[model samples]
Target: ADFDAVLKCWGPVEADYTTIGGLVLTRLFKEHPETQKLFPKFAGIAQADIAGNAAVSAHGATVLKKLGELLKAKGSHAAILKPLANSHATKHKIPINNFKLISEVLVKVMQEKAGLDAGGQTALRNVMGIIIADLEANYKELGFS
Candidate 1:
């Protein structure tokens, strides 16, 4: 019923972060080499090697899982969620637009794997929307807007 519970329910079912993140990262490098070059540590590394790299793979997995966990805990707790988003934005030097791209990739992958009729699709969309909104709101509050 709560937002966090909704997100937790949607996440593992609709998105397997570890697997998807690895695959998406692989795809990014393959489809958009420029984006691949953005990752200084993984730059010039083969996709297979980046996929195999324990740390990058682990962080990719961790980011999705941890993001889900944090959202589930914060739910409608705007104060708590704000700081968490800001922390991530700062840590990754991520732009609000990057979250949009991530969401687009996530949705495309989920649709391919499970189809739009999948039980979790709507829920996942809802959760992702909330997350993006919260993070963007935080960014705006901090004068990024």
Candidate 2:
């Protein structure tokens, strides 16, 4: 119920780049400036300005759409995440720790937008935990300590 409730709440804004994905990126860059270096386009741009940037906005939309698909999946979504994690860790050379940081920021934004109660928050956290853990497992397989 909690999971469903949270997902339902997100339905309207799941594809809203500026509101959901952009906000998450905005908060992430603000709180962890070093992470911005991972994005060639976003690097050196002010955090406050990121949400309005067309490229960043497009990236945010893509991320949110991917997340929406993951959340809609019935069972484990690790398979879907594995390739992405590989690309992020290998092609982009992004650290696993950066993935964790993004997860933290994403959850914070989701919670804020969902306005979930304690139970809902717990469910959302649990879901995110599973997602992160699965991704971490893939990272570990690739010898990322």
Candidate 3:
């Protein structure tokens, strides 16, 4: 019931990153329909049309792959964090809040798929809080926000 239990749940879900990643984005757009605009390919697509789209699935996989890298560093290290924040801010044009939003959906997807418990949820939340804070800080300092 301590900390590593969270990783136990995280392991299986992350092991199947592709499917779980797809579900996370699917759930995100479903919960926040306006967010679909954030995706260049997904912008005009209807809500129901998102399913089975190969690009979305591919993007989903990328998100999870990169996320695995972030978690590998436990979401620290400017070397890893800076480039991500820059691209997301300048190139990708994501808001600070939207980045945080994904973490929320990520947690929920893990909870549903991995059965992450209350303690685990708190663990995930705290980890995300630090990462998001660092990313947001980079965004502002880089003058892209």
lDDT of each residue in 18-83, candidate 3, tens digit only: 788778888889888778898888888876877667678778888887766766675446788888
Instruction: Single out the weakest 10-residue window by summed lDDT for candidate 2.
Output: 9-18
Error of 2 at 44 (Å): 0.9
What lDDT would candidate 2 get against the real structure? Answer: 0.74
TM-score, candidate 2, is 0.85
TM-score of 1: 0.67
Q: What is candidate 2's lDDT per residue for 39-125, written digit by digit as tens?
A: 987899976678787777678778888777777873357678888779876788787677668777776776777666566667766
* TM-score list, all predictions: 0.67, 0.85, 0.89
In candidate 1, what are the lDDT values of residues 1-145, reduced to their tens digit?
Answer: 3354345354443366777667656656666666655667878887667766666655567656655565566555676677767875776566676666666565666566544444456666677787888888888877776
Pairs in steric clash, model 2: none
The weakest ten consecutive residues by lDDT in model 1 span 5-14
What lDDT is reached at residue 103 by model 2? 70
TM-score of 3: 0.89
Using TM-score, rank the candidates from best to worst.
3, 2, 1
* Residue 136, model 2: Cα distance from true site in angstroms: 1.2
